[PDB]
Amino acid sequence: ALLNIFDIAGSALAAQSKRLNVAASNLANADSVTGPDGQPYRAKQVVFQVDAAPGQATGGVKVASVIESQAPEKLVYEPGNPLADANGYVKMPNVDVVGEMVNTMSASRSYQANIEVLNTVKSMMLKTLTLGQ
Amino acid sequence: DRLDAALRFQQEALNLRAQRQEILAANIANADTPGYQARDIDFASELKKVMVVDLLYRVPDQPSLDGNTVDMDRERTQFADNSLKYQMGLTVLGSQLKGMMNVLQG
């Protein structure tokens, strides 16, 4: 379907968009006490894999799944909350602020770099077709 | 006519590229409609069928809240690729017609 460069750069754009979405969702839920069921929000992470279609030669980036972080959930002593345990510590998400801003900046700069790569390739693509005519 | 048989493949490819271009632009235009499904066609299978259309739903990547499954990046890349392939088909068809012409000129 897609040309190889198109597929690689578009996969890069989609992967960076997914990472930015995960960062934004984490930054929104930084102060959430409960979900829809009664469990604390867990910071999400996105794992980049190389989609090496040929044997070890090249390939874009794919995202296998969005994993839930395994870090000590923040404990805040609020015994009056219905979600407090026997000891009374309500669970707050493990979303760090600085890491998510850094992730947003890095995802934006990778997105823009891949956009520039596509823009650069495009002129050569259109100029290839003048070879025959 | 034998002239049709020579130019049938490129004409059908060009028409299919134009139709898929229209479908992709419709997907772009209706990006903000809540509940709109992103539709597309499988170019190779439909080209087989015409040489010897049905719309297939695009697999959503991110779940939106309004039910819109149109992804900007994927369809922008597909739109650019379809434009490039339409230009390539125009080039090939023009080259074939120009060759058939210089065979006759004299």
């Binding site: 829809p36 | 499904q37 695009r58 697999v59």
Partner: peptide
């Protein structure tokens, strides 16, 4: 399967409830 493939089935509606039903 892969995000961006072609299927003959529309995706299920995207519901996001606020409370558990």
């Amino acid at each position: 399967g892969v995000p961006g493939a072609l299927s003959n089935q529309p995706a299920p509606p995207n519901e996001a409830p606020i409370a558990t039903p």
